[PDB]
Amino acid sequence: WFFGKIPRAKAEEMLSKQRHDGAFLIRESESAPGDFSLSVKFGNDVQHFKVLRDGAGKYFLWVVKFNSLNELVDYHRSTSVSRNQQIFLRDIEQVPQQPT
Numbered sequence: 001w002f003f004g005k006i007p008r009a010k011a012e013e014m015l016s017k018q019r020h021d022g023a024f025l026i027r028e029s030e031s032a033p034g035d036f037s038l039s040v041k042f043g044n045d046v047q048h049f050k051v052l053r054d055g056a057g058k059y060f061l062w063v064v065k066f067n068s069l070n071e072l073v074d075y076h077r078s079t080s081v082s083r084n085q086q087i088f089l090r091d092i093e094q095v096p097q098q099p100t
């Protein structure tokens with residue numbers, strides 16, 4: 001669900017292209033090392049949530065924090081995340097791997 005340097009636009013397409021509802025995708029800055037931004041699809045609008053961190057790598061949003069980003073996507077994948085409806089983080093179909 002992680003993506004290197006990609007414009008908010010590209011992300012919206014990655015989620016929309018999906019079939020389920022609640023596709024999440026975390027993108028990282030280009031020259032901003034240590035930055036993380038989650039992009040989830042909600043209906044006909046692609047929302048997002050700026051991810052923060054403190055100490056060293058530990059990230060968080062409001063009152064929840066973890067060591068790795070994986071703990072965030074998971075925690076929210078089972079526990080509510082939106083402050084409007086009841087939706088979870090759906091595992092996005094990361095880029096396909098077609099080896100030779």
Ligand SMILES: NC(=O)C[C@@H]1NC(=O)C2(CCCCC2)NC(=O)C[C@@H](c2ccc(CP(=O)(O)O)cc2)/C=C/C[C@@H](Cc2cccc3ccccc23)CNC1=O
Pocket residue numbers: 007008037038047048049050051052061062
């Ligand atoms: N942490 C969160 O994501 C929750 C919350 N965000 C929101 O309420 C919403 C959620 C989706 C629906 C509208 C409201 N989003 C925003 O304010 C936008 C968010 C954001 C995230 C990712 C990107 C990357 P992009 O430009 O490539 O799309 C741009 C903006 C931009 C978020 C920046 C926040 C300001 C902020 C800046 C730096 C450090 C912070 C530390 C703690 C709290 C806020 C901080 C203010 N907003 C929020 O804290």
